[PDB]
């Protein structure tokens, strides 16, 4: 309870250790593009939960996108969010609270464009699942 507990996946624990020990200068990156830590509340254990996630960003605000390299399932990030939508993302030095809210119509259209646009690989996501992909937005706390 509020003790981390890092991911099963030793790579994604490595990758989330290298880069809250670094500010983001080390595994900041996938496919050549900006990474963010989110940060949430496991809904079962109340472990604190770390999840590197594309950075998708405007105006303070930032889309996280729950599609799991496109598996068919929601991450548990995602299901954590739905019970809690409190998070804290660090984005390289910044640490902000924030609180999550799954998007829907025009604003979702809005965002979807805009994560695309920072990670095109998305759409191919999109394309290849009939369910509608999770867009979350994260707001200032
Ligand atoms: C494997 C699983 O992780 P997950 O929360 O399902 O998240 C799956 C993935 O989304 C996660 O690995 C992402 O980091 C993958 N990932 C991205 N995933 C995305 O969905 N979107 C991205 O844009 C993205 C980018 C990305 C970039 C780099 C990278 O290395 C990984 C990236 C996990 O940690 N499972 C734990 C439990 C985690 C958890 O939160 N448990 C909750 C309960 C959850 C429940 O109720 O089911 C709790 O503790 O209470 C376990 O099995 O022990």
Known sequence: ???????????????????EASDGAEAGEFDGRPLVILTTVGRKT?????????????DGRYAVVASQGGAPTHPAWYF?????????????????????????????????????????????????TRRLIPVLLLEPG
């Open 80 to 128: 954590n969010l739905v019970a809690d939508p409190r998070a804290q993302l660090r984005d390289k030095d910044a640490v902000l609270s924030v609180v999550a809210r799954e998007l829907a119509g025009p604003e979702r259209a809005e965002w979807w464009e805009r994560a695309v646009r920072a990670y095109p690989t998305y759409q191919e996501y999109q394309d290849n």
């Open 1 to 19: 309870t509020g003790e981390y507990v890092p991911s099963p996946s030793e790579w994604i624990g490595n990758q989330v250790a290298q880069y």
């Open 46 to 58: 109340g472990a604190l939960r770390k999840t590197p996630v594309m950075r998708v960003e405007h």
